[PDB]
Every structure is written in C-alpha cells, then in structure tokens.
C-alpha cells in the first residue's frame, strides 16, 4: 500500500540526512583540529623566521 511505500521513502530520506549529518559532524571536528595544527605550524614558522631575521641583523654588525 500507499502508506507503506510512503514510509519506506520516509525512512530512506531520514537515513540519508542522518548519514550526512554524521559526516558533517566528524568533518567539522577534523577541520577544527586542522585549525590548531595550522596555527601551530605558523607559530613555529614565525619563530624560525624571526630567529633568521635576528641572526642576519646580528651578523651584519
């Protein structure tokens, strides 16, 4: 029947959204971790190139 066909589609629709929702959720957490990794790489790189600037100046004197 009509209600059973309709309920099969309903479940299929909810399963889909529920699956994407879990993917978004995990991907979002991953991207938030990547922001920490990204600020850490940059912080390291700022230090390193500040060190380089200081050496170069230092050596110039």
């Amino acid at each position: 029947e009509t209600l059973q066909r309709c309920l099969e589609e309903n479940q299929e629709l909810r399963d889909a959204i529920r699956q994407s929702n879990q993917i978004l959720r995990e991907r979002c957490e991953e991207l938030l971790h990547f922001q920490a990794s990204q600020r850490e790489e940059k912080e390291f790189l700022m230090c390193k190139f500040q060190e380089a600037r200081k050496l170069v100046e230092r050596l110039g004197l």
Partner: protein
C-alpha cells in the same frame, strides 16, 4: 526516533558549522606571511 522538524534543524545547524569552519580556516590562512616586512633579506 527524531521528529522531522528536528532532523532538518540538526542538518541545518551542521551546514552552518561547516561553512563557518571553512571560512575560519580560510580567514586565518589569508592572514599571510607575504604581508610581513621581509626587506631584511636585503
């Protein structure tokens, strides 16, 4: 089960969060080393 109103809200809020995570990542990266004074390289 979830009410339907509810699955859609969740899925809406998760969409927003991903758009914002992306934007935040892109904004922090666009905060670029090229904008620093490298004229000490001389």
């Amino acid at each position: 089960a979830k009410k339907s109103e509810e699955l859609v809200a969740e899925a809406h809020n998760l969409c927003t969060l991903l758009e914002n995570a992306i934007q935040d990542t892109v904004r922090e990266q666009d905060q670029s080393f090229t904008a620093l004074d490298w004229s000490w390289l001389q």
